[model samples]
Target: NNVYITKVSAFMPGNPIDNNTMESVLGFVGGRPSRSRHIVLRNNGIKYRHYALDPETGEATYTSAQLAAEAVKGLVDEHFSLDDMQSLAASSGTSDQIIPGHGVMVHGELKNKPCEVISTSGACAAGMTAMKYAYLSVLSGATSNAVSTTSEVPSTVLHARNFQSENEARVAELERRPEIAFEKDFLRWMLSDGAGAALLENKPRPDGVSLRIDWIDIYSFANEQETCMYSGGEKLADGSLKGWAQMSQADWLAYSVFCIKQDVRYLNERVVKFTLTEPLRRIVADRNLSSESIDWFLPAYSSEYFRMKFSEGLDDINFSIEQERWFTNLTVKGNTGSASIYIMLDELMKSGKLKKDQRLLCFIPESARFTGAFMHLTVV
Candidate 1:
């Protein structure tokens, strides 16, 4: 079956806030600044990132649904119409409401004709999951045109008001600012808010290029390991999680149950091994893939530290895709979580770097319970 990503678009709201101004914009935690802000920015390699935020007031200017709407709107042109949009799959983590599924909200905000809407929720790989769904839907003859989108509003949670715990805001004797753990503070500098979408159809671009979906595969090691990144829950001693429903009201704020947290030690140690090695080995063998087979490799690794480590993982699997063969906008665009892959693809396709018959392999790793999604595409 042939499914093609015929067009792509991304919508990044607001201005590119720089490092020195980031804390000013996102606000100081607990009226006390961050010690790791400088340190995190150094490692993450992110210079400027857009937030769906009003820089002056630190208030949200765009919701997740609105972000998704903006990107989906851009997919419309002479070649495609709203009447042709038969299915929509949206992947998101930061919806404005907790009750209704995000898909309905996006569909409502998009205001297109009633179409099949699907929502996927998870860590970074959720976008790929939605992509797979849309791909499968189109390949199965469910629809002639399918749209897949990923939107992120991480800044909504990254605000200082979300983490008002006074205890963690104390200055150490040697440190200039308070000590917020790496697990909690790491993503603050890395994450930005935006949305990106791809239009998929059974046919290739009529006059231009299209990325033909060769294959998309996903793997998870949840049973073999415990959760690494999480929210709306607390961790127990046995590496298991206790959801918010079981906890007391007093305990909720005390535990900061809603704030996103990661087991950094677990993430650092187990990430590359589970997310890259184990699954990629299976993929390489199954597809008979080679490093040289991929003309451009896009890896959705957040920081430069982990980026280098992922390179090493390729070496571990005895697959060598040269460093130059990789493509990333992590330093420039910020990690917009699930939207990073779609946004990266949009940039690559628009940058005039792609040519006919070029193969692109996208790698996305989810830290929450160690899941990875890999997709193969060919330029047509």
Candidate 2:
């Protein structure tokens, strides 16, 4: 039996927040203007992005689990029902809490019958983790159908309030205009809030097109790499992490320990090599995959600037696909963390672009210690 992706859907919270309106919606950190906003925006090429924020109140509108619930709702149609759903896989870069996990949170939101629910926790490859789990489950006959979803409400963390302490600028010049580090500020312009879901079935639809899952390859280079992007604590001087457990509540607020952070220099130097070239070489050799054989190459990158580095990585592996075959919605959708690849797939799937036997390749790379997933699909 072949497992196929029968339906894909996405949800972008609120309206499309443009460049000019972002500061108003998210608010200036510490009520001070951002210094790095212009340069960060320039390289990302994201013209529009969604934020689960109430502009008037400058507060979050939707929780991470709720966004996923809405996306899953879009997957339900006359042909598909929750009654037949056997597996629910959920992922997020930052879930609401660390206690219960996202799967149970989303399950509660669904209010559906009991089923196998899983929560995959990660930064970017988290979405692929759910997809891999669902793919294997359906292919192994453990379930007839499965749903995998990735939803991120990073706007909750990105808001200006989190970066400031109770110092709260009360002391005027003495307190200084509270501000976040460049790494934190960098993410503000790069990430957005969105949800994307995909339904996988053991059989394809009777009359419509389906994406046959030929293979999914995942790799991690943690053995050879250090943490490039992180949250919950701090990245240490030697690439070690100072976990939240080691810190106090005041320190948590002072350091914004729960907010996402990155090693920009480390990311630029080693991301492509560990995430793409190394794993891709093995994948290409094992699957007998070639550059010309892929009809559409979908790459989910955080920055449009990374296109150059991505190309270099492919070149290093001698697996370069022509530029015309590439497809992505990063500019319009922004980087939705783990949900990005799924969001891009949803757009391409609904664009009426599929042709019989057309092969598709999806590349997802995570900067958290250089992890990645590459998926192969064929239209049928």
Candidate 3:
């Protein structure tokens, strides 16, 4: 049985917020009256990106769920309909459910539509995991029609208060151990807002082009005790959770502000080193895949530094595909978290560069919990 992606859709909310505008917003909100943000902007290689908020007013024009709803709705309206969907899968690190900490609100856009909703929670890689679930469902004849969508709105994820704590000592701590800069990091500027989704079917359509899912391999290093990247939840001094309901105002603020934290050294060193090599080498060997056999490689990275590192790591692993054979829109699109993989793939498939019947490889690396997914697809 073959599962094909029949339609790919994306939604970029609000207008493009360039680096200068973002830097200004950050500086103003960060209480940095004289901070120069040019280096941070240049280092990320992001010129412009879409945000769900109004750039000037900093008002949320679209929520995470709304962005996701728009993407899925666009696909359905353009190619199919919500009534045809047999199953739905959604993924996000911070969406309607997180900031509010309420029940799932994404489904509200569907208006009581009857279908099983699979909510994946793997942070940035959550979207790929959603795709994996949809693919398996279609492959096993459990469902003939499925929709997988991923979306994120970083502005909504930030705490309401500006970084104005009298914590100048925190700066000294960071200077002494820069690796522990998770408390106040540049990821705030690296990520933006958007959504991407794809419609999957058990059978291919005769009238249009489709991407056949050859295989999807996902592996986790959780067994290695790697929780280096994470968000949400409160960690008490005793290393136990204080129930959400039992938390006071201060506890809630602490949890919300520090929700998205990571060990920079672990991510840059261990996760980066192993994610690109170990599982990839195994997958290539098992599938008898070689550089010559693949025509295109679309890899997702959270930052330009990581992108270069990934390229170098690829060469070191003897899995180097030519630079001309791979492409990315990270500079203009920024990193959209779980939505990035599909967003980049959507751009590639519609770029008018790929020829018919060409084989493509997609690498999805999620540092949230040290997991990775490799997807094989053939252009139709």
Candidates' C-alpha lDDT: 0.87, 0.88, 0.73
- Looking at candidate 1, what is the lDDT of residue 55? 71
Error of 3 at 311 (Å): 2.0
Report the CA-based lDDT of candidate 2 relative to the real structure. 0.88
Model 2 agreement with the true structure over 180-257: per-residue lDDT tens digits: 678888887888899999999999988778999999999999997999999888998898989998999877877788
**What TM-score do all the candidates reach, one by one?**
0.95, 0.97, 0.87
Note the clash tally of each candidate: 0, 0, 0
Candidate 2's C-alpha runs over 4 A off are 166-178
TM-score comparison, 1 vs 3, better candidate: 1
TM-score, cand. 1 vs. native: 0.95
lDDT for 131 in candidate 1 is 90
Comparing 1 with 2 on lDDT, the higher-scoring candidate is 2
TM-score of 2: 0.97
> lDDT, candidate 2, residue 14?
87
Best by lDDT: 2
Q: Write the per-residue lDDT of candidate 1 for residues 1-380, one digit (tens) a residue.
A: 69999999999999888898888877776566788889888877889899998977667898999999899999999998866898999978787787787888999988888889999889799999989999999999988889999899988888776776523433323445454566777777878888999999999987878999999999999989899889888888899999998998766765567878888789889999999889999999998988988899999997888988999999999887899999999888888889999889999999999999999999999988999899999999
The digit string of per-residue lDDT tens for model 3 on 279-317 reads 888887888888888898888877777776887888877
Query: Once superposed on the true structure, which residue ranges of model 1 sit more than 4 Å away at CA?
Result: 165-181
